[PDB]
Amino acid sequence: SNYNQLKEDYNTLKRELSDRDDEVKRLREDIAKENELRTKAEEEADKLNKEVEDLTASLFDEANNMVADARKEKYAIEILNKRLTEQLREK
Amino acid sequence: SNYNQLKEDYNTLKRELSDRDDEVKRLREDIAKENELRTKAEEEADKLNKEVEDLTASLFDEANNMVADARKEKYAIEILNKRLTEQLREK
Amino acid sequence: SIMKILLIGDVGVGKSCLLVRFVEDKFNPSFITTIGIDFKIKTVDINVKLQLWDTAGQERFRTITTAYYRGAMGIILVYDVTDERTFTNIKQWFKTVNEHANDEAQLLLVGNKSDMETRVVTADQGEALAKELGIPFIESSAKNDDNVNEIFFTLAKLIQEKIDSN
């Protein structure tokens, strides 16, 4: 159109290039951030995986202990039933 | 001369750009790749706490269920226990 | 002065019934049927507190049950002698173990229900498995209390012996 088509296209290209060069400097820092998230998430992954037995042990401890205590207290009163079902009996 | 210089400065930046379009395309894969990995590290830590929340409700519902049973039958005996002591006093 | 021990094998083998009998506490409950785990603590005198996992090995808590392999100081690989396919299913357990097992944790075989006698496996056929794998062997009855307290006592020795190598 023709020299202005040029002068102008070059100017357009110049700004396409600066947009593109920025988006590159920006995706590079986007990745390093996304890296920090990745590593930190794989640390969590791992951390929990280790901590879990111990955590779960602790639930079982308590669960068993809860039922034990409840069960002993019943039993102890069957012993009471026994002893006085027989305090009466012979007598 | 200037018309020529422009022509090839255009050509230079034309590829200088084409290069960034490449370096963007690749960097966007690399992040989606990084985010793939980080999705997986979140993916499993959920899976896990899902199981641990699942255990904790269940184990504990279950223990209380058993602790109800103990108490339930302990009280039933306690009833008979009184009934018998009420006969020990008669004698 | 703790030690972590875990049991390993199929349903019907007699792993509940072994643990039940090793630890003589009747007041303790059994979740092994309701949820699919149990966990006990028996103190024993060697000259040391045990802690013992048991599992129905189903999918539902597979992620956690696995966590026991990682921290387990001894594994007990258990088979039935009345059942032939349980006697063979052992190596698929063994690789399953060492992909998860912390390398330096110690293992042991167990041939159970010697008691019930439509017994397919011999004792020497049992050390035929044990030999290759580089791991100690015992057989027991869970019912009749044969070698039960040994199973655990021998295993814990090996581990205390192991600690002081380094």
Ligand SMILES: Nc1nc2c(ncn2[C@@H]2O[C@H](COP(=O)(O)OP(=O)(O)O)[C@@H](O)[C@H]2O)c(=O)[nH]1
């Ligand atoms: N005859 C016999 N039966 C056993 C012995 N040990 C366990 N059992 C039985 O085998 C069945 C399943 O055993 P269990 O302990 O539930 O196996 P687990 O699923 O590996 O814990 C039950 O009916 C037990 O009573 C044993 O030494 N002799």
